[PDB]
């Protein structure tokens, strides 16, 4: 091959070359070796001659690298030898100048584009020290070829006459041979690798302080350790005994460290091996890059002997040399061409050549290697080895700021600790490293925290607090309060009632009571009977209730009803309160079961966590003693009884005699009720999931004054980082937020991060120290503890564990596990310790998924959605469907702004209208009562009463009623006939909500001047006056028949319309009847698609804002949907249509939902919408209101998600909500979100000139036909190598300077067109 | 274990000490006390003192097999498996209880009686040996020989 | 287990460093301070650091090198202390033995240690290890600093 013409890069030279790319992942660097050497004196002119002599000897030292090819100069333009004679200077100024010269030329991107792949240099220190140093870009050379450059320099310095022959084999001839010679082996290995791409492990999942994509300037930090002669001898003789190459010893030991520091013990590590095979023996003197890169898919086993592990690593290594016939880089490309971002960014360069790395001819000329640096691009941890002296210099070219500070240090100290543990001890020992002792010592303190508790029955202290002060407040309810003596004697009455009913020590009892003093008296009564309470929501569905009654083996149920014949004998708490009192609580030894708390029975068989009194009271004391809870305290029980936080409220709060403010069952999620309860009863303590305190704090400081609130407990779900910042001014002075960790299986909690305010290095509020008496581990999947900063499964231990799942011992042995460290609840939380011993929780284990080519951090997707402008909160999940899509969800914070000032136009209605509807109500009541059997008997009697009560006895009218309603006697007939036919089908709610004569908002769209309400709502949609495009939407579409009745006022020129409903079947009718210029999309399972946020200049609601579960729900949905300065258009039922009220009674849905105009306008101005009221008086009142700058829009979301996330975790579909839905046990309901998105889920040509002229560039570079825009470059056939030819092709085709990182975030054709569209 | 691994300070001896215990472990290093199966013994229970953590020796200089017998690895890290007996008292102090094995103290120095016996078997003419540290105020090391008899018919 | 995890968990309370580091710092900080007192004469930290660094240079000249091991077998006195610091400052691991340690036992140890060299007042380059006079290693050129050893050597 012509010896000065461009020729192909070797595959691994492409890995370095493309890693120089300023936009490549952890790129922008040379792949140079910098070597440094010491001597008292050398002749700088001998060096200058020697350096230039070796350039003119070896072609590859004078090779230029351009266009992803290499080309050899007769001599390079740029200087061979950086001499820096400072023999005259002040010593420490010379040392500082050396350190600058060092940091520079050891981090330097060498000018390989100008053939400067090799550069020698020399500082001459005034301390009498010539520090010869050598920056060789490994684009020229292997490290195994770099030692030959040292051999050539040693001779060329000392005795250049002995440089007997310049190696005649040109590297282009070696490649033109090798690339053809490998061909069958490369195909044979390609077929091996292709079929393994789905099965390849990840990069080592090490702790990173920075994403590798989030640094442009990767300085290598070397860590190094010189194994002595003797340690080398011990490793070499033990390597001989165990039959392994010495590289396999060091590679196995490294892979064991990386396994111990990875989230998973399976990973790729790039082994550069030394393919110096050729026909010419002078290949052993050629300086060119004989590296070949082996993608060693190591899978390091735990607990085996090191002798087994090293033979395994060797077998893998050796066998995979045959597969390195298809090079690792082309495997990483084919992974990208198969949609997987796989990399081996951790490296094991075993340059163990037995002579000493620095060859003897050089060791004579200058001292053996003093120090060295790699700058390998796209590699986090470039581990190398060198024989140095006759010992072995271990080197770890970690990257500055990529790993946590002190982590490559500690991880390398564990690696050296391991290699000496291999020198001085037989390899029959466990391959498991110790934890590096400092880390384990801290964790032994965190887990060592004494009980700080007294082992006693859980109820004990409350009965003492009662005997001490019977008249003191125990419980404060809707109005009335129960004292401790009252509550204790009530509990003991229930206790004796339960003993009489056959309940007895540790036997289990359902407590399904509405939240209130009788619920508390029941749990204290169950516990005082010695029994174990099984709390459930009374609103829990009956099938789930039967599974839990069965699964608890429940002896009895307390349920506000007597049914001794049910699955358990079921009892009225009021009859149990008529029972005999016990003299004292039945004596329990504390290890007895205290409660069984159940997760959602959507998880199949319901998991019921049986907690002992000892465990519960241990957590409780361990928190009471930190909260300093005292007799003056007053908690709020926002925690449901089947949510274990209530156990602290009950047995903690009343154990300290701190009274409970109890929400009632209608207040069970009501922030306004809680706010009044705090402001009224001066609540000092709070305890909840954060979603409840977020909901409490969502009310203004004036509307909801929490400054009584001495301390706050948050639990059970991710606590947002702003939340302490929002809370500090709201709660008492000295806020004392505590965030608490761990599952019910560890009692109520297991951690306490106290929070004054968030220190800025947090990414979630971590679990703190373990609470007193209990403990945490973070473990590898093999149950061994993972290091600090390393993510693993959190295990919880010690004096707070639940006994198990109540009657599932089989799951209990899987989820509670036992070690020399004692007993552990195996939580399925991910998390990691930090260096300070804090415990970062990182979501449940299923909150990571290996989605189709990458691990998704769903917690990070949520954190990145929370960083968007105007977001309150977010969720991320992975879905059903044939894609198994990623899905994510948002909520806006609404900028509350007090704009709500008004007047109401009351002049248009009159009482003869309401009388007309009262008459029509009587007539259609009477018409269904022509076939009165279509109702149930309860509705039949209601309807037979309303036949007089809703009629002439209140609001009489003549046949003028018909002329007020607009529907005449034909309509009365058609309504009565439709209603009897529909209910002879029993088809409420679904068909009732489909019907033009009878649907509740549709009859409100005719009867109450409803079409005239609809008309004046649709009027001032400005587009037929302005002549300009307008985007409208409807929130409450149902059947579309109520819209169709207004549609003559809606079909305006320039009007685009989108129709929404929280129901599917109703929208099928809307989509049937309305023209193709009007769009229809479900809010399926409650969920708005994000393509609609900020899109609509106008939004419509008709007689249905009360049909949301709050005003604040349907309002926030409207506000999110509105474009800024856009108008909500709403009619709200300040009173219902009397026929829409029959409609609601046939849903059997409560009329209490409706609200007044000030009540609407207050919540609506809190949703930020700036209002005017306009129409229909105290009936069907029209409001219009103007949207603030909420910032949510799918375009703006795409820009923020492109700013903050890699392409592997795009929100593949994205949605929004008025607030996130909630678990019965307080959490954000991530399952309902995941299923809801799963329901709500349900190529084409380039058409822009930029897409088409880019398709020409892709087709030129990829050959395959670029007919489709929707393809992604790598998936179509691209590589980073081909991304250079594409960039240069764009630089010819358009002339724009392409940001290649932005193209890697934007790999699809229109995504690439972005930078051409903005003319970059 | 490095130069020491425990420290009982002694401003006074409380009368229930049967010996001055090993105190708290020295900072940065640790003690387990184990059953003959490697699991920790409960407090007051006698077991084998395992010294652990950063202070440990790397092993024996060229005896990898004896190193693996002593410097053992566990879910709790790396441990020296001393063959000292002892018990954690209820206050977490560590009473050392002497040794179970052939290792004894002569004039403060450590001696393996197996070494003394082997140095006597290294005598031409000894078939086998015993050694022991003796009673009486002298606390002397004694040893006992079986001679080899050079048989004939 | 909670108590014992506290007592074992006591934090490192150490800066991991070469064992000799601090003495060479105490010498550089006050060369004149009395390091050793012996037979009614005394040696300064400076004198001792120099004596040690001369031994270290003599040991690097005698083929000793980092983490390779060196017997020290000297009568108790400043030349012994200078020699162990000099071994450590040569980067080597010192393998102390009493000068009273008897010859066959010394050969078991010199054999088992794989020892590069022994320091013994006797010069004998043809002993089992090459054996060296500390007084000749004290004629050696001083190393300008102890050899940089990583803490785990
Ligand atoms: P592209 O054509 O490469 O296609 C796209 C992919 C995804 C493959 C691309 O983005 C990518 O990852 N490229 C490959 C990067 C890579 O593998 N980098 C490491 C190559 S390794 C190597 O042999 C180094 C490590 S050890 C050695 C060394 C020894 C002493 C001194 C310095 C250095 O660098 N060389
Ligand atoms: N409540 C609760 C317990 S507390 C329950 O029930 O539930 P669960 O599921 O089981 O649990 C919860 C979850 O999550 C976690 N957490 C706790 N805490 C917390 C959390 N997250 C976040 N943050 C916090 N703090 C647990 O562990 C599980 O997983
Ligand atoms: Mg759970």
Residue numbers in the entry:
A (entry chain A): 99 to 1340, 1348 to 1425
B (entry chain B): 844 to 996
C (entry chain B): 538 to 690
The authors write:
Briefly, this product is produced by a typical NRPS assembly line of four subunits: PchD, PchE, PchF, and PchG. PchD activates salicylate, PchE and PchF successively integrate two l-cysteines into the growing peptide to form two thiazoline rings, and PchG then reduces the second thiazoline ring to thiazolidine before the release of mature pyochelin. The adenylation domain (A) in PchE selects and activates l-cysteine; aryl carrier protein (ArCP) and peptidyl carrier protein (PCP) connect and transfer salicylate and l-cysteine using phosphopantetheine (pPant) arms, respectively; the heterocyclization domain (Cy) condenses and cyclizes the two substrates to form a thiazoline ring; and the inserted epimerase (E) catalyzes the epimerization of an l-cysteinyl moiety to d-cysteinyl during thiazoline ring formation. The structure of PchE adopts an “H”-shaped head-to-tail dimeric architecture containing five connected catalytic domains.
In conformation 3, the PCP domain of chain A binds at the acceptor site of the Cy domain, with the hydroxyphenylthiazolinyl-pPant ligand observed, representing the post-condensation state. The A domain (complexed with Cys-AMP and Mg2+ ligands) adopts the adenylate-forming conformation. In addition to the dynamic domains, the Cy-Acore domains between two chains of conformation 3 have an r.m.s.d. of 0.566 Å. After completing the A domain, the Asub domain is interrupted by the E domain, a noncanonical epimerase that catalyzes the epimerization of l-cysteinyl to d-cysteinyl. The C-terminal PCP domain is clearly resolved in conformation 3 of PchE. Key catalytic residues interacting with hydroxyphenylthiazolinyl-pPant can be clearly recognized in the A chain of conformation 3. N368 can form a hydrogen bond with the pPant arm atom. Notably, D480 may form a complex hydrogen bond network with S472, T474, Q482, and Y114 to form polar contacts with the thiazoline ring atoms. Intriguingly, in the PCP post-condensation conformation, in which ArCP departs from the Cy domain, the tunnel adopts a similar conformation previously observed with both EpoB and BmdB. Similarly, the “Y” tunnel of PchE Cy is truncated at the side of ArCP by the residue F372.
